[PDB]
Amino acid sequence: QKKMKSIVEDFLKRLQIFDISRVPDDQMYRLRDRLRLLPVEIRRLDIFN
Amino acid sequence: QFDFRASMHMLTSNLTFTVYSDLLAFVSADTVEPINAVAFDNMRIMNEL
């Protein structure tokens, strides 16, 4: 039930150079899809394990 | 001519009943949360979440 847009929104906000008000939700979900294919960083992955 | 034998009848009916019009008023209908609504293929209607 979790809509991941917020995550990506936060992600963009922390890059500090994009204006997320100008970014549609479709682009954020495409970013979500691309992020979803990347492996997790070793420390974060072990903590989650 | 009026004939009593030819005019006396017994009329038969039911003692009482109640006629209803709105059958669907007897159905209690609820719906799932739209986030969880699925299509004919048993997967969620909208999966981008």
Contacts of A8 in chain B (CB under 8 A): none
Helix, strand and coil percent figures for chain B, each rounded to 5? 20, 5, 75
Method: cryo-EM
Q: CA–CA separation, A13 vs A23, rounded Å?
A: 11
A1 vs B: CB within 8 A: yes
Q: Which residues pair with B38 in a beta bridge?
A: B44
Chain A: give the shortest CA distance to residue B29, in Å: 23
Query: How far apart are alpha carbons A29 and B47 in whole angstroms?
Result: 11
Burial of B39 (0-12, 13-18, 19+ CB in 10 A): exposed
* Total residues found in chain A within this entry: 49
User: Running DSSP on this structure, what letter comes out for residue A39?
Assistant: P
